[PDB]
Amino acid sequence: STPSIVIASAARTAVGSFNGAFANTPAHELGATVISAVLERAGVAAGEVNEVILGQVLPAGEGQNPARQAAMKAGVPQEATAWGMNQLCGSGLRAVALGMQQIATGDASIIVAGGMESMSMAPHCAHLRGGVKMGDFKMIDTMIKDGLTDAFYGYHMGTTAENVAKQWQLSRDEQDAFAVASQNKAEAAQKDGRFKDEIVPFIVKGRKGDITVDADEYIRHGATLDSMAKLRPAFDKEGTVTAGNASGLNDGAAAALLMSEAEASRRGIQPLGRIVSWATVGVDPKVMGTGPIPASRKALERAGWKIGDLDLVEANEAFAAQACAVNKDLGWDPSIVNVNGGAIAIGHPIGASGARILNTLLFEMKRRGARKGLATLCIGGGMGVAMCIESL
Amino acid sequence: STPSIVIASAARTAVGSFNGAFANTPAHELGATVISAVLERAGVAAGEVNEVILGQVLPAGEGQNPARQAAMKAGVPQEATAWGMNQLCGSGLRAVALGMQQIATGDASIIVAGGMESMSMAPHCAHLRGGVKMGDFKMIDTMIKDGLTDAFYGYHMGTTAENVAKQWQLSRDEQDAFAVASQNKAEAAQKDGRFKDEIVPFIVKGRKGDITVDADEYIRHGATLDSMAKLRPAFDKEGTVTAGNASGLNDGAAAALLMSEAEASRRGIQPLGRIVSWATVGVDPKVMGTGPIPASRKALERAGWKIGDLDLVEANEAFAAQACAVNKDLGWDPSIVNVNGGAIAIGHPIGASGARILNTLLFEMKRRGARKGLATLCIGGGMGVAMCIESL
Amino acid sequence: STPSIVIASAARTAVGSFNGAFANTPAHELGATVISAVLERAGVAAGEVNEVILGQVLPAGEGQNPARQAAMKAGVPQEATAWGMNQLCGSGLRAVALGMQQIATGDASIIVAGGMESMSMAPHCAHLRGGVKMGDFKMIDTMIKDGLTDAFYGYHMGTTAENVAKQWQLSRDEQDAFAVASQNKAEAAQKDGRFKDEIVPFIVKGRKGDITVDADEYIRHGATLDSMAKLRPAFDKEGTVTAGNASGLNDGAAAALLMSEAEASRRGIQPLGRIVSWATVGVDPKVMGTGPIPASRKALERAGWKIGDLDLVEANEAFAAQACAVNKDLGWDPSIVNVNGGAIAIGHPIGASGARILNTLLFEMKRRGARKGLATLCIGGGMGVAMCIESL
Amino acid sequence: STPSIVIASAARTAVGSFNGAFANTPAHELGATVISAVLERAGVAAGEVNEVILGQVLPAGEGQNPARQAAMKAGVPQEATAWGMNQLCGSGLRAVALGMQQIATGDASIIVAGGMESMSMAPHCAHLRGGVKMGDFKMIDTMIKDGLTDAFYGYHMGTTAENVAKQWQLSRDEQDAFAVASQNKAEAAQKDGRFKDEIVPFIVKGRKGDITVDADEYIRHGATLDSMAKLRPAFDKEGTVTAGNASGLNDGAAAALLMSEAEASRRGIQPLGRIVSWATVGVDPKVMGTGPIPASRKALERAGWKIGDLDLVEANEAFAAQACAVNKDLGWDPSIVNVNGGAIAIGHPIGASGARILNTLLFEMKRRGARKGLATLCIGGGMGVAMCIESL
Secondary structure (H helix, E strand, O other): OOOOEEEEEEEEOOOEEOOOOOOOOOHHHHHHHHHHHHHHHHOOOHHHOOEEEEEOOOOOOOOOOHHHHHHHHOOOOOOOEEEEEEOHHHHHHHHHHHHHHHHHOOOOOEEEEEEEEEOOOOOEEEOOOOOOOOOOEEEEEHHHHHHHEOOOOOOEHHHHHHHHHHHOOOOHHHHHHHHHHHHHHHHHHHHOOOOOOOEOOEEEOOOOOOEEEOOOOOOOOOOOHHHHHOOOEOOOOOOOOEOOOEOOOEEEEEEEEEEEHHHHHHHOOOOOEEEEEEEEEEOOHHHHHHOHHHHHHHHHHHHOOOHHHOOEEEEOOOEHHHHHHHHHHHOOOHHHEOOOOOHHHHOOOHHHHHHHHHHHHHHHHHHHOOOEEEEEEEEOOOEEEEEEEEOO | OOOOEEEEEEEEOOOEEOOOOOOOOOHHHHHHHHHHHHHHHHOOOHHHOOEEEEEOOOOOOOOOOHHHHHHHHOOOOOOOEEEEEEEOEOHHHHHHHHHHHHHHOOOOOOEEEEEEEEOOOOOEEEOOOOOOOOOOEEEEEHHHHHHOEOOOOOOEHHHHHHHHHHHOOOOHHHHHHHHHHHHHHHHHHHHHOOOOOOEOOEEEOOOOOOEEEOOOOOOOOOOOOHHHHOOOOOOOOOOOOOOOOEOOOEEEEEEEEEEEHHHHHHOOOOOOEEEEEEEEEEOOHHHHHHOHHHHHHHHHHHHOOOOOOOOOEEEOOOEHHHHHHHHHHHOOOHHHEOOOOOHHHHOOOHHHHHHHHHHHHHHHHHHHOOOEEEEEEEEOOOEEEEEEEEOO | OOOOEEEEEEEEOOOEEOOOOOOOOOHHHHHHHHHHHHHHHHOOOHHHOOEEEEEOOOOOOOOOOHHHHHHHHOOOOOOOEEEEEEOHHHHHHHHHHHHHHHHHOOOOOOEEEEEEEEOOOOOEEEOOOOOOOOOOEEEEEHHHHHHHEOOOOOOEHHHHHHHHHHHOOOOHHHHHHHHHHHHHHHHHHHHOOOOOOOEOOEEEOOOOOOEEEOOOOOOOOOOOHHHHHOOOOOOOOOOOOOOOOEOOOEEEEEEEEEEEHHHHHHHOOOOOEEEEEEEEEEOOHHHHHHOHHHHHHHHHHHHOOOHHHOOEEEEOOOEHHHHHHHHHHHOOOHHHEOOOOOHHHHOOOHHHHHHHHHHHHHHHHHHHOOOEEEEEEEEOOOEEEEEEEEOO | OOOOEEEEEEEEOOOEEOOOOOOOOOHHHHHHHHHHHHHHHHOOOHHHOOEEEEEOOOOOOOOOOHHHHHHHHOOOOOOOEEEEEEOHHHHHHHHHHHHHHHHHOOOOOOEEEEEEEEOOOOOEEEOOOOOOOOOOEEEEEHHHHHHHEOOOOOOEHHHHHHHHHHHHOOOHHHHHHHHHHHHHHHHHHHHHOOOOOOEOOEEEOOOOOOEEEOOOOOOOOOOOHHHHHOOOOOOOOOOOOOOOOEOOOEEEEEEEEEEEHHHHHHHOOOOOEEEEEEEEEEOOHHHHHHOHHHHHHHHHHHHOOOHHHOOEEEEOOOEHHHHHHHHHHHOOOHHHEOOOOOHHHHOOOOOOHHHHHHHHHHHHHHHHOOOEEEEEEEEOOOEEEEEEEEOO
16 A cells, blocks of 8 residues: 545745734734635535644744644644644644654544744743842843754854855855845736735734735835845855845744545545655755755655656745755756745745745646646755655 | 564653752753663664654753754764654653654654753743833743643643542542652662663763762652641642642653664664554643543554553653543553652653653563553643553 | 022923833933033033032933933043932932032032933843742833832822822813813924923934934824823723823933022123022822922922912923812912923923923023022922022 | 031941842831931931931832832831932942031931942843844843943943052052951951941841841951952952952941031930031042042041041942052051951942941941041042041
């Protein structure tokens, strides 16, 4: 026997700007909106879900197991189970793979999997148990410390982007021209409603009126080459990596309902793809941006695919330095990568990002009629992750 | 063939008291030591490890992916992978299930899985990005907030254990008799040397001298009934759960080394046991302590076992109310349950506990000649987790 | 020969709104600009200053003795001295009386006195030296706790205002009419340029552009009765005191340069006024708004003046309720009182407020040729302070 | 008529060690006990007090105007007034001069003046209103920032002491001997009972029992030269200033009751002394410890006294470096200086200090029948204060 698991349906919230639309929205509320979206999208009841798996890197102050909080809110019953996980920036795609294994091993019928992040709602913290007899103590930003800081080399993820830039000799112009392309592609898809299918509106409840967010607010309209070239380097003071050519700090969530291919056929569901293979591999944390290269190669090797059989790719844009590098090495046609733009434009809600690009990949595959696709992301601390999808 | 996954080796640190031995020791330092110890007792080099999965509930401020930090510090190379997960209190036993599924689906050969927790190091926090225009606020204790406060009703786990008491008509004398029986069992076994084999010593690097922690310090010697019956209830001013018949707040780590049964035989490794089956199930959050009941029935049914078949049990004592309710329903001989003691005496490092009680079961099964064996736990928010084990 | 002290020159900054124009300006920067202004307006050099005395209620986190920081920044020599003082709302006026006394006793020739306050920059705090063993604790708003809360009764100053409303039988209509009138009179004075003489502009230094602040930003233009009528009681849910008939939370500095009458004559300075008398008296904390009553009476008795001898009055408007009470009891003609509006409109930068209203008195006295003035304020904790000024 | 003000009576608490006897005692509680004491000692009823004046550098979080808190606790009537002031280390003496001035200008008859401080209770703070959009921020120790750091050069008072050691070429051995001598003189004086007359005991109310504190707890008994010599410099890795030859962080209060000489005679009071003169002068902040030189010289000139006229002197020991420079420059017989030890032994409760050493001077003057005395302190930010006292 050979299991065969499918992504029956999918949905992501809009990607919100740092301290923007979802500045005060807990992640699990966003998780709840995507959970109910994929349940109604597949025509599966919440009472049929066995388990819910959500990546999330910054859960501090949100209470017990936010994965359970989002399941219970979304109308999943208490007889189910739920948990979160953290492979950092790869978390939201990894969870989908972990959900695929629950079914493959005979321990679940129907999983909901993805990620959720509120980088806005991430707190400052300090270890205050001992007590402070004298002297300033630091209140630590958990978003910077737990999401953006290499634990081994002490510097920001964007410094790793400098390392990869200098390795591959990627000029400031090349990085900027990739950054403006991503903003133009993304603004172009948004106008044309190519993001409508995947986005489920989130309602931000308010004292003085409810608001419906259904649009990626981080996309810069009319992004220009000169606007990119005007900027100062954020990390290295004589470097190449600017705020324009790296992705942002963002809020959002994204998911996929998974079931066996036969169960989908029982119920008349038309899946957004079969999960044919997946893989995660580690590299040096100094150049974590190279993660997607070994990861995307192993995934393809597991599918029995060559790189030149693909039709579509989502390769996550943490930095125009590392995105450009991954693309150079693997050699896939750049006109099939980030067709609707990438993270530099859309945003980078860490734990949600992997389900985010997966959502974007599956819907464009349905839209253009691509059969073979791949989603991959670089990962802080030096990993990569990847997934090969085939359209039914 | 059948995916027949074994536990090649196992190791834990001793469990520390809150702000005690491991007071200022990062969880990942504690998890580093167990990853080396599992690799040593098996005879398996760190380079051969594909991935490290560690359950951990309270990572705030410890930096990017402490599972990865634990693995790198232990000498597992950059090429391997690592990630955290959180199903609260079952996390450590569910990571062993997850790592098993890696091997069963053929995505990995060798996994080190378990849990780690530093509850002493968990910080206080607040969301301060919007600022606080006027008026007092709370700096929140993330240990309480994210580790012990049920997200649904707003209260402590010691009130969910009170709901199990009023429902199952347990007395203030019935619980006081179970807590002293688990402190006497654990003091007995400790002075016997039955904990020796599972514990790997941890070195607490001081400045005015090192200290070697090689014994659980939450175990209290000479537990009387007067001290247990003289306390005031902590979670209800006229109630039955106290500090003495509830579990503690603790630090600790624990892990198993996993591979296929065929691979153990090639390497000349006599495995502690074979993982026959596992399961998790949800229950009403209000009465979370009854997770072990349906979870152990699911696990047992999957193995094709009766409750009678079992020769040794590890039912985690989060409380004396949840524990007695699980022992009475399932009706298994309590003379074989928590045979060297439970978490009232031993302690309760949230994320580690699942991996902690797996150690105790695996080393006692080896020693007393018990063929079959089940470990089980209750989980906050309303779930249960269980894993059946068979001897070679 | 009895010591005669004169106010040679005075100045204030504009009064900023809470987290408004001066949101991130330390009180001492504001004080430094007013110190430089009184010196320039009197023709006295910084080098001649013996002492600076600045009332200030909320200096936490600003560093050692902000009054010295203000004097040094203003170029007052290191050989001079400087100190801060605190009689709450009375501070800025009390400091002038204290300055007067340094010259009366022969200990100094030349004093700059007043006060300064940045309610905006006041921090949140907690006592964390003992160490917090477990659970949540409070970050205390120092502005509320140290500035606005009665230390004996534990309620806000606005609750003392409610006590005064009840005792003097002051309707919500009478309080709201008074409030609207203070806004309309301030708006009119502002429009006609009656605050220009007293205000020295303040340059808020910026990364991306300097902003000159020379207008009182808290004054509401076109304030309507209905806008006051619509508000909810802020302190007693069936009370009369609201946000609209109370003063606000504000930032500013204000000062006066003093010397003897004979000294002003040698220098050829035409002084703003002679300090004829001052007084300070306690009342019940519960009705602290009544402070001005005994304080003004005692100040007039010391001058040898009848209430009817006054040509102009500044009675500070902490709350409409108390301003009304004061005016009723004293019986002075209301048309000579706060002729250019009061603190309901202008603001109440606590430690500066007494020097703020003295500036307004002095510059209107000059403009209209009023010979006899009085400035008075109520004081949290139950006190009053009053000063009689006569024109030369 | 040249007003002649006497110190009718005086008192102080013992000086408490940092987080020691008065660890959770608010400063106004200490002040209340000394207010009661000066009244009882002088035979004056609380109802007769016109004003209370208390220096206090670190009032954050204690609530509105702690001077008023103290006065009201001590039964001083609501109709009196009270205020705090801040001239840093000079405060507690300056407040006495300012009290004298109330009486001298005919504004009051009876004043209670001194200082109070609880460095233990001083909180950590931060400005949080604008929010912290991203990145770490410090919780600031208000004791260090507002008490002990130079606001201009950003360094500790200890560095100014190093500046004075370098400038006066004061060896480590000379400073250490001075420090040892302060300890041994204070020990001898404590043992002989010489602090008993000045100290009023203070009841620390407990929950498991009340503790009466009537001994200065910071004084080290049996202090050795070797114990000073073994310390490492605390501020300059190659300096001379140490924990041992500097004063400490402390809690306490101290006060004097003032009235006219003619008033004491009416009441039949034998006063502790007549205030003959006072002075305050500025110096370079970099060498603030030199303050006492120009202040003492100025106070003596004012009194009409030569340095040689003095029979007793209290010169506050902030640091052995500056105490030594002061004594060298003035050249007064070091045998009449700090005859019962100084603040290196006794402690330095900032705002209370100047009234602390006034108390010790007055009670030793009475003891030995000394006719002419002077007290002086150096002040943070570069100032000096001094008062001349003559026995009746």
